[PDB]
Amino acid sequence: DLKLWYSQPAQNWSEALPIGNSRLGAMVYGGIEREELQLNEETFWAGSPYNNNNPNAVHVLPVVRKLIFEGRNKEAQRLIDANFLTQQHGMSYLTLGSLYLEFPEHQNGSGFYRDLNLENATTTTRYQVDDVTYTRTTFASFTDNVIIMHIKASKANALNFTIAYNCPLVHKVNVQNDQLTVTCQGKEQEGLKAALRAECQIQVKTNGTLRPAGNTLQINEGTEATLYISAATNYVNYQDVSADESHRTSEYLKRAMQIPYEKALKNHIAYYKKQFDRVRLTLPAGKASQLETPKRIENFGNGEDMAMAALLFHYGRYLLISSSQPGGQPANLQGIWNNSTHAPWDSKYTININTEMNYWPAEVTNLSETHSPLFSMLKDLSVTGAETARTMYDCRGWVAHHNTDLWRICGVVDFAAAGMWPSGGAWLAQHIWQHYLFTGNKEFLKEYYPILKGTAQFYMDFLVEHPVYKWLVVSPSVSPEHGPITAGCTMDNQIAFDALHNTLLASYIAGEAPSFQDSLKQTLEKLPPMQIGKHNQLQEWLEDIDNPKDEHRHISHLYGLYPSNQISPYSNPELFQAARNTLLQRGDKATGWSIGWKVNFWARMLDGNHAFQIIKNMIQLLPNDHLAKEYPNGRTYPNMLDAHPPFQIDGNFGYTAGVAEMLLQSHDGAVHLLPALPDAWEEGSVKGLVARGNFTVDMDWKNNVLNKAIIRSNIGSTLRIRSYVPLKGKGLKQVNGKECSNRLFATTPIKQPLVAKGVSAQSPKLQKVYEYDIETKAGKTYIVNTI
Ligand SMILES: OC[C@@H]1O[C@H](O)[C@@H](O)[C@H](O)[C@@H]1O
Ligand SMILES: C[As](C)(=O)[O-]
Numbered sequence: 001d002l003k004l005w006y007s008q009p010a011q012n013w014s015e016a017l018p019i020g021n022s023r024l025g026a027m028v029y030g031g032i033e034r035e036e037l038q039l040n041e042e043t044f045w046a047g048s049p050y051n052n053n054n055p056n057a058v059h060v061l062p063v064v065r066k067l068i069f070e071g072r073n074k075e076a077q078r079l080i081d082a083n084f085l086t087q088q089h090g091m092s093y094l095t096l097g098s099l100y101l102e103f104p105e106h107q108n109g110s111g112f113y114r115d116l117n118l119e120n121a122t123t124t125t126r127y128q129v130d131d132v133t134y135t136r137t138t139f140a141s142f143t144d145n146v147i148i149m150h151i152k153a154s155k156a157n158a159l160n161f162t163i164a165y166n167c168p169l170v171h172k173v174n175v176q177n178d179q180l181t182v183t184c185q186g187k188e189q190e191g192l193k194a195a196l197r198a199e200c201q202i203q204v205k206t207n208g209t210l211r212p213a214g215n216t217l218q219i220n221e222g223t224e225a226t227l228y229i230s231a232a233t234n235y236v237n238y239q240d241v242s243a244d245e246s247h248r249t250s251e252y253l254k255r256a257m258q259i260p261y262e263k264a265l266k267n268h269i270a271y272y273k274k275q276f277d278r279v280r281l282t283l284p285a286g287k288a289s290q291l292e293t294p295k296r297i298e299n300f301g302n303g304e305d306m307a308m309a310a311l312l313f314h315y316g317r318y319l320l321i322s323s324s325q326p327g328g329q330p331a332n333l334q335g336i337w338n339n340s341t342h343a344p345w346d347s348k349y350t351i352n353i354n355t356e357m358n359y360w361p362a363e364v365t366n367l368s369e370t371h372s373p374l375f376s377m378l379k380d381l382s383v384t385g386a387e388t389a390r391t392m393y394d395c396r397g398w399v400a401h402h403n404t405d406l407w408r409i410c411g412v413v414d415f416a417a418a419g420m421w422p423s424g425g426a427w428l429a430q431h432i433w434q435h436y437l438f439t440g441n442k443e444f445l446k447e448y449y450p451i452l453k454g455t456a457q458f459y460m461d462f463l464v465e466h467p468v469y470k471w472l473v474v475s476p477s478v479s480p481e482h483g484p485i486t487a488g489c490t491m492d493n494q495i496a497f498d499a500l501h502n503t504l505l506a507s508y509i510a511g512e513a514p515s516f517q518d519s520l521k522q523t524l525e526k527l528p529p530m531q532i533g534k535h536n537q538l539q540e541w542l543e544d545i546d547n548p549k550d551e552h553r554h555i556s557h558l559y560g561l562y563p564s565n566q567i568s569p570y571s572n573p574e575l576f577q578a579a580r581n582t583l584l585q586r587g588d589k590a591t592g593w594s595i596g597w598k599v600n601f602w603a604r605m606l607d608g609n610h611a612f613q614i615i616k617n618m619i620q621l622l623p624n625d626h627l628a629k630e631y632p633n634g635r636t637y638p639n640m641l642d643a644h645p646p647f648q649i650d651g652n653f654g655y656t657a658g659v660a661e662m663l664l665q666s667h668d669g670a671v672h673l674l675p676a677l678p679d680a681w682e683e684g685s686v687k688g689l690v691a692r693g694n695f696t697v698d699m700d701w702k703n704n705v706l707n708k709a710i711i712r713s714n715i716g717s718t719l720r721i722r723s724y725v726p727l728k729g730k731g732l733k734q735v736n737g738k739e740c741s742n743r744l745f746a747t748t749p750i751k752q753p754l755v756a757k758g759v760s761a762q763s764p765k766l767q768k769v770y771e772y773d774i775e776t777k778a779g780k781t782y783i784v785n786t787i
């Protein structure tokens, strides 16, 4: 059960299958008389180097702030829209075009089968024409940095086809020396000129004959043919476009063709398997699980295909591996897969939930390497966003708002109502802190500390005293993406808290001046506390203005519940219950990404049954975008890709991290085994998850109860297990009272929440937990059993 298969070739982009090696991507249709591979390279975007800083903002910031405190929010907003933005609002990721293979004589094909196999990161297309069988194997090589397509007829000399290319961009195609060569111009956008070019080269190994035919390349009388597809651009970094794209493309191709095909395949599969075989979720199958995958998606609701949930979980891991690898660019709104020259929201990096969600799987699902391209981006933003901080706000450190792109802009995007939100940089930076919590790597933390610290330094210079309540607050900002431009947003308070407090914790490891550490504490102590309001809800703003029917897709004020660690049912039961009520008020549906966050939310609520209800709200078929009005509840394409709609990859990755959080939590402050297992999943296993403190964890269960767990300690120190059932095992002390000495999965104290006048704050219903301690040694493995 690790393949997606189909009995008809793709009729549209939502039916085609994604492959990629992080840099090159293809979407594969499977068409019989004509195959299409629509291509992408991760650095092919519109525009040039630029920024969207508006220096007018520094002159106007005090006046904007005065008005907000006077309740004149519209006037402040009109002032923001005129002085804080430019004419450029993030450049669009682009398509690289489509390669077509034309099989004119393959008229009446039968016995058709298409798949994508997650075991080995290859797609297969197979069919009969008369007595002859045809088989296509396609993959984007992790080892040879080219896309490869291998085609085999089962009869001698029976293979004849043409290779051609098209693209919506301005392009040239030339056939010389049996090599098809494409050059592709980048694109002008919002008045910014095009500095990028792409090149693509195709060659073919075959026992048949090769010859040109206009701007196509024709193969005749073959038995096997093997296409080698290379491409690259002139991008080096955000302010350097001087590389030679032709040389780059030639070099990849030359090198890839030195290896024979069977070995090149083996190698690819091996390299992929190192990252992919680390983790498996197993849930029981039925006969239903054998059906083709669009049917599995459609019928998931009826309960007879629990294993499908596991398949979608594995798909997220495949996608992250296939879209994000060390040395490259981070996964954008669409991963690396996009066929437009003006995509939805420019297939950019949206950093008020979206880009962060993409990387939730990285640590917990055992894909730590996939995280690197993001840290790499953070170095860039720590420079370009220091320019933003200085020019616009006259502040030290660095900042980013709610969107950035290949050129690493950090200013205010689109318009104030959604864009005036200076906490994007600070949230992204927390991915540094989490990488440390999960790996324990102190060397990493010291390298990246200046960057993390930079966000804390910005807040210390940007925060201002609220005239009435005296708390330090972030203004002007919004709770993404609704309500007015305002001051004391709960989300900004939670992110500022993490920025300051985790900079502090890191400072004891990195080394710092006592005076800078005392600033951090003095600043934390002045931040606003969280609040329970008149509907027993957690307040999104300072004032008690939450609307209990509002089902807005964003729930930005539960950042603290997830992905942060500020709402614990043990430390703060009353607040936890207010979060619960907030979640009931927002409801279970909305966009694909919204649904993905909610699986994590309900996992942190320790409510497996509700989490599984969210899962059922994602696994519903949207056949394609042409039929969205007719299928308005569909959130998964026949691709198994997530639908906002349209296609947005956030939800695939949010879902995967969600299933993990259902089975394992390590943030508060113990390693919690099966914290949110649905009654639906009566029996199964999971292998390979990671807990903070760098523990790898395997678990299996029967009758809705943990049976056995196997925990490897990758770096030693104390392990604290937490469970709903009592446990036994070698060297397992029970513990009551004193907290654990391991800081990595430890939680952190928040300010006492305030309760509104005449509210009697409800208390949550919690299962009794049993906690145990183990003293562990790096490299060793410990087994735990149930009583
Ligand atoms: O850039 C993508 C957009 O980002 C915003 O944060 C969100 O409101 C939209 O639903 C969408 O995901
Ligand atoms: C206005 As836009 C879709 O280029 O950010």
Ligand SMILES: [Ca+2]
Binding pocket: 022, 023, 042, 323, 324, 325, 328, 329, 330, 331, 335, 336
């Ligand atoms: Ca990438």
